[PDB]
Ligand binder design. Structure first.
Ligand SMILES: Nc1nnc(-c2ccc(O)cc2)s1
Ligand SMILES: Nc1nnc(-c2ccc(O)cc2)s1
Lengths: 171, 172
């Protein structure tokens, strides 16, 4: 029983199973041509979009091995989240992120709205194993609170150092 | 981390060891099977053993891993160096956990006395549990870091606190 089981390759990045029926990802990684996802006809899937945040709800249990998790709109300022990065190499890369305010930020030429954060590995990501790269978009932001894991958003963007990041959030 | 470093990480006793060269193998002293009289088809008598607390080095009289080149082993690393701990987990999953290295320290952990180079994991607020942190079976996994032009190995996983971010690297 692991959080990592819920991180799934999806379009040009990743997504996360909140429940047996609920899948979250970053809008810009979703395929733009499709009749079905995970074997289910697109005609039977509810899609809820808010900027760079997308939620899918399926009409049957795709992952009945899972329990439903808490999903919240971002987290308090100063929370140290973990971004759960999967790589095509086979690497699992949980990185600490100190979270700040919600904002519209300029990132490599584009405007991105979500919760800002800064990696604790700091300086420059120097090595692919201490920061994010473009293929990582849709990875989840999580933290432990009392006994429960909380998911509060998905990886939307990062500056050239790979050290300022944006977490797209619900609503 | 490069495939040539993960190929050196070998399942061993109750954890792992690390091939520094074709003839040199390092591990954490407490993962060694205390009854073992033979390793990789060689008798104990044909092997040189160097032991300093939780650090153990094996030197063989012939090439066990001829596919490898010798790499640099140092005695810990400068304070503030960021290392990866190269942890293998269930079914080809590779978990290179980020750690900021601190001072040489002596601690009591789970009642046991441990000595080596302390570090603070950079994976979450606290690393309690297997998704963000280390578990007993991780002991012996190597601490590596990249410099300008190459990679260095600077010790082996010896211990971690109950419910915190603190780990200890046994050093030469
Ligand atoms: N549109 C929706 N917003 N939240 C939903 C949710 C959250 C947590 C769960 O475990 C399952 C569903 S549905
Ligand atoms: N006693 C020893 N300390 N270091 C050794 C070493 C280092 C790098 C190598 O490639 C091979 C051996 S032997």
């Amino acid at each position: 029983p692991t959080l990592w089981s819920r991180v799934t390759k999806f379009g040009s990045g990743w997504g996360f199973w909140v429940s047996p029926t609920v899948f979250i990802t970053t809008t810009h990684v979703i395929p733009t041509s499709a009749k079905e996802f995970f074997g289910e006809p697109l005609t039977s899937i509810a899609i809820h979009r808010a900027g760079e945040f997308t939620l899918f709800r399926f009409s049957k249990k795709i992952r009945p091995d899972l329990t439903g998790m808490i999903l919240e709109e971002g987290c308090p300022e100063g929370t140290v989240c973990s971004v759960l990065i999967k790589r095509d190499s086979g690497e699992l890369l949980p990185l600490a992120v100190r979270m700040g305010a919600i904002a519209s930020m300029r990132i490599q030429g584009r405007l991105v709205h979500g919760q800002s954060g800064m990696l604790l590995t700091g300086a420059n990501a120097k090595g692919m194993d201490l920061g994010t790269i473009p293929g990582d978009c849709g990875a989840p932001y999580v933290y432990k609170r009392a006994n429960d894991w909380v998911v509060c958003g998905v990886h939307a963007a990062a500056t050239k150092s790979g050290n300022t990041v944006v977490c797209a959030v619900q609503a």
